[PDB]
Amino acid sequence: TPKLCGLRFMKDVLLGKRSDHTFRTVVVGDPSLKLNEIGI
Amino acid sequence: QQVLYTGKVGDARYPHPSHWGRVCFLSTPDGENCGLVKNMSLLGLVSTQSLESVVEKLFACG
Amino acid sequence: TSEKGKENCKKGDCAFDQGGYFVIKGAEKVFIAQEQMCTKRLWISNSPWTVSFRSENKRNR
Amino acid sequence: NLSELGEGFLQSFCKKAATSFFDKYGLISHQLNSYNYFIEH
């Protein structure tokens, strides 16, 4: 059972994809920053 | 507690009055196995098979 | 580990685990209690109405 | 008498009995007893 077959194959090959230039980190609160600004 | 399927189990996920003092009813894992896995209480003992036979002693009582 | 003294056990286990696991391939394995229906009590079910006598050792249900 | 023992004595005895129970069986004894029974018989 590869688990990548049928509908899941479609989802993982054409519907859902992974892209470059992406970052994932935990988020905290900073009232000093403006509403449209994100702290990096 | 083994169940064929996880989504549909029945009333086995809820605490029972038989759990009083044997298995904790306030602490159960959260998720798919919610209530299927039960933690034993502090004063919890599991009985073991007795080598001696109580049949002979029962007749003495009456 | 059991029997005799624990002076040599000090040069050994950390005396923080009572010991209930198995060393299979260097990884500790612990059994989980499995709840099973009692086989020494008459079992009555519905749809259909039936009463069954469980089998102790051989399939004499 | 029924009340001659006293309330505090019963509380102390309950604590001592709990300590003795934890000293005799321990936190894990069911698994040890089950494994010992399997080996012996």
Added chain:
Amino acid sequence: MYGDRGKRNCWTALLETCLPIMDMIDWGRSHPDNIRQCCSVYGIDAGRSIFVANLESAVSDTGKEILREHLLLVADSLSVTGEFVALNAKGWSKQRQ
């Protein structure tokens, strides 16, 4: 009513029973509660209106506020072919066919 057999329509059977009391029941507003056969009984528009009312009731029960245009668009999209198809792939395939 009882769905023992689908041989006869429940609404038509109810109409035959209420013959002695036809005047008492206001047939100008009475309608089946189901959405699927309401189109067959009173037309696609009546079923669409009842579906919109039920959707508004469900949204109100959910506690959220949704604009009318969204629900109206959903209702008009689920009944393009004149029949309320299901949300499964079979309904989508039938609508495309």
Added chain:
Amino acid sequence: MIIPVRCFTCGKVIGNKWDQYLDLLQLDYTEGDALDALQLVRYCCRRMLMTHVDLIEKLLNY
């Protein structure tokens, strides 16, 4: 784990008071009286001297 020094909350030196605290506990002194004899008026230092567990003994033995 030896007795922590510098009383994280307050900042007062408490590193050299563990032996005196143990000596006071050896006699007929309660925890409060022993802490008072060490001149600890803030309850943070008293908590630090009271909540410490001596673990280095087991490390040396084992």
Added chain:
Amino acid sequence: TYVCGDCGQENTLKSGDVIQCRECGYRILYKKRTRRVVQYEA
């Protein structure tokens, strides 16, 4: 230099096949720490 287990003895063995302690029989060895200066930021 390698330290043995329950027995105190320096094996000082670098051969690939030499993994067993001499005159001890056990095959557990701990690497010994030499005299090297290492700096830490307090």
Added chain:
Amino acid sequence: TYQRFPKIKIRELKDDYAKFELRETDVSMANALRRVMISEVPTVAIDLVEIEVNSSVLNDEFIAHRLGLIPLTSERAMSMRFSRDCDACDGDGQCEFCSVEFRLSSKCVTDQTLDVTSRDLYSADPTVTPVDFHKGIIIVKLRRGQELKLRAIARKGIGKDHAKWSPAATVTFMYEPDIIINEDMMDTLSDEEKIDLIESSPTKVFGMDPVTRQVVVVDPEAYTYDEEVIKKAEAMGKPGLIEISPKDDSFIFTVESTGAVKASQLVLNAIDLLKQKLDAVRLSDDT
């Protein structure tokens, strides 16, 4: 429009404990003085630790961390220069201005457990000897064998970073409240109510005079600003029986040092550092 004229009265003064009253000043001045003496006064502490033998059960970083927290005499802290400012040396071993070298070597050759305290810590400069209080601060406990030899360097630092260069230990200040009693509504109160009112105070701020059969104010500086007596008076039906308000221009300071510097010297250094900060902040006129 011009400067203030604060007045200072010292109640108790010791090597590490000082308690004085500051009057005729704003709250901001006292708060700034407290902040400067708790986070701006520099001291000397070990920051770099080099070890060669670490056979002890404790980890190297744990030993270094507990070595850095040892209080050291900081009489030369004001005169010493910062390591980053010191340009004569890049920083290695003993320096005439910034770095002070410490040597520690402990070997246990007896059955009894050997305790590595702070007393067996030797430095080239006698003025930077660690403060002695007793048996000293225990660093590591050693069994038979288990040698411990290390080389440490202590540098001047500010208490703002790493919170280990702070000589102050919870320096406080209060407003020194004044207690006002109507003395007329007390006559209406019964003897039983007076005792209950006295017991309502969390601390010993009010006393009962047996000769005059009336309450008196004793030790007004221990009120702690807990509105217990006022709430009790309001509950009893007397709203304006006791009126307590803080005094804005009066303060009582409590300074406790860690032994690095004297409390009076700590206050003087804090004042000097605040003056230097003001001088640096001062802006020249522009045409």
Added chain:
Amino acid sequence: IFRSLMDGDTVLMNRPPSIHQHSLIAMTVRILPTTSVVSLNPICCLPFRGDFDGDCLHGYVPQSIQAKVELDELVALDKQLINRQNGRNLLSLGQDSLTAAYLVNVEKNCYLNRAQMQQLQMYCPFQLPPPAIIKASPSSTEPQWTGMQLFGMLFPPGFDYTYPLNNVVVSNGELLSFSEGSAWLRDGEGNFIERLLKHDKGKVLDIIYSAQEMLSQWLLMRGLSVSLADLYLSSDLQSRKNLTEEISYGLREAEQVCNKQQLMVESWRDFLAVNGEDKEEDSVSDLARFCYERQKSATLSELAVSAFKDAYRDVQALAYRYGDQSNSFLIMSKAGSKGNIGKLVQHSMCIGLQNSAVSLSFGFPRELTCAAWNDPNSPLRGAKGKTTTESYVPYGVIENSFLTGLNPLESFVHSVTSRDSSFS
């Protein structure tokens, strides 16, 4: 040809799963000295539907210039000000901001002097209003500013607002009047944020940011805390005893109301009619049978639950009578930032009704005491023998509260009731 990320760049931020289109927000990069974490304004939590408790937001850096250009023109926060679901404003004040606004607009008895007012004016964009309080005492100098004028520096001079329900009138950017309710502050049909957005829509974000900063500073000056006095919900011990007795009597009255409501069935039409019936005493003598009948029947259970809620509204209403104005729980409930009246009632007075939707094999024996747990005829012991029973709809009332503690039977009942939430 690659350069490092810097200030001014736009990154598309998302919180998985994306339930609505507003989860995708284009935000300008702001470099911070902190490491291994990303900082977000707490107000922006509502579009992401997440809190700062371990949530991870994964962003996407657009490489092509066209994607960046379309990112800040359609997915920017200023572009998504209007919620596309209901047509209201997407961004609200937030917990602390809402609570601080409620406190500064409700108290009206605390005055700010010149120094504090000027310190708070730094964050506010608009100028300082007149003190409006020249002398408050014959010997009181230093004319002060009222709290409501502080909140008035958040509105443009041309802005005009009117909320009849809360008696809120804003003329020339000045808050003239306000009574209670705090409904205008919270999100709604006539919230002031929506009116500000419909007024200018250019500086609404700056107004919200300045309001948050100023309210945070004001609340820091004041200080908000929860103590044991708030949970006690009584001035003294006598008030606590009176409240306990009142709660007990209210629960008894609610139980009697439920028992009366259970009779609205076709089996008691002969008794409910206006005639002469000698079985009046038998209807009130069987008190324990009503619980058993309620647990077995689902319609009776629903009717009893409805009646119990209707009667328990009055019991919940006692918190305002026995609660102080300075209570933090009451302030947060009235402001709408967090919690409600029922949660406070469970905190202090009583947990109340505890019922489970699913059918179970046991039933709560109407008392939740040690003696009830030992009764062989209780519904908890399988069946009451009144012929046996197979399923039950549990129904129990907990007289104790969280502050007073729960006996093990009440804790078991609460766990049985709340076990359904933890399911997947």
Added chain:
Amino acid sequence: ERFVVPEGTKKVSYDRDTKIINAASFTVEREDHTIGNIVRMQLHRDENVLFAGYQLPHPLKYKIIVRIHTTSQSSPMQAYNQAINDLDKELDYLKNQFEAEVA
């Protein structure tokens, strides 16, 4: 790292306010609440000063912004320097008093 003033950046910068006459903003780099609060409190003692306040908008960016509004009798920079001089004199007096009290 944070203690050192950034290279090429002056500690205090003067920026006049065009909207309001006799108004200016002083940006003090690498400063905390200690200096700002005492400067603000000293400025209130001056009769010519109308608006006196400070803010620390970004804790990460160690900067202090001081805004001074004065009447048509003295410049904001003059009031700032006068407040600094008065605070220095107060510190000198307090040091002398403490030295006398110790002895």
Added chain:
Amino acid sequence: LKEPKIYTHCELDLSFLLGVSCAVVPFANHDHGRRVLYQSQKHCQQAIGFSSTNPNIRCDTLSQQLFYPQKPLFKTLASECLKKEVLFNGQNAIVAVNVHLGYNQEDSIVMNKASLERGMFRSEQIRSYKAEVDVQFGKTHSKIGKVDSLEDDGFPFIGANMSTGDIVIGRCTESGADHSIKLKHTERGIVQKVVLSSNDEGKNFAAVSLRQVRSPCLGDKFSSMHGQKGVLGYLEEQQNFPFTIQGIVPDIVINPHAFPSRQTPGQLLEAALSKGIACPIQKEGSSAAYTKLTRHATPFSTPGVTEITEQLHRAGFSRWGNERVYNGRSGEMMRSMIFMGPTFYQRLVHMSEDKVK
């Protein structure tokens, strides 16, 4: 004792009904069921406390130990009977329920920078790498790079700082091929010990342990004993905290808005009880009053609120657990008293740098 001859049996203690991970929780019956379940299931397992007293014999992966474990001020009957201090894993710090410039919104946590730098909530992480050889261990590929720390036997010397792209275990063939194991992007630390062992079959096993001291960073997640869970929103200097009359600054600051939603009473009760226990009972009395202090926090045997208030009042503080505080930035006295108490907190295994991708 109230009514005899009607009860056949009696229970030794009602707290023994709960599990080992649930009976140790103080004021368990005073908390909501969901939070008790969370604390007894997940937070107890994720706590960082005592690792082991013999770390040398164990080469287990991802072993974590706290520098200064502390037992709670309160006592539990189950913990007292078990006579083991390993039940509680964490440290108790002064916690104040107050808003701090909006940096603790959305159940966030603000901690004291000074308190952490003194050695609070500091833990060490030891990670082990295992390689099996039946090619032999050895240092090869001269002048290739990243092999400076490797010795002649193929293993790094103890005390070497290992970074990414460096070989931790060196395996080479007699023909010059290198089947060596390197450190990945997120792998770093200082080598602690090297263990060489072989089985009866003759296969050789090598274990290298890397250790690194972890300090509480921003994204680190912390949990309480009553289900209160959050991340460290901001680190504030000691001088800016709202110091009390005696200068005791809070180590942890939590937002008041979490209590009405989570419905977790007892944490305030725990704080009040711990404060009453820790505070010195002077009373100007020669009699030993320290032997009459309520210390046990058994769930079903919890003391009443009145007893806790009386004990706290006898300590010289307000009976409601709140004390007057002064703003650290301006020095002014706050209008409302702030509740402060030494609650017991736990540091979870989840870290910010572990989630960075």
Added chain:
RNA sequence: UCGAGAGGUA
């Protein structure tokens, strides 16, 4: 590395 089974995060 390609997979499977577990345990956890929101």
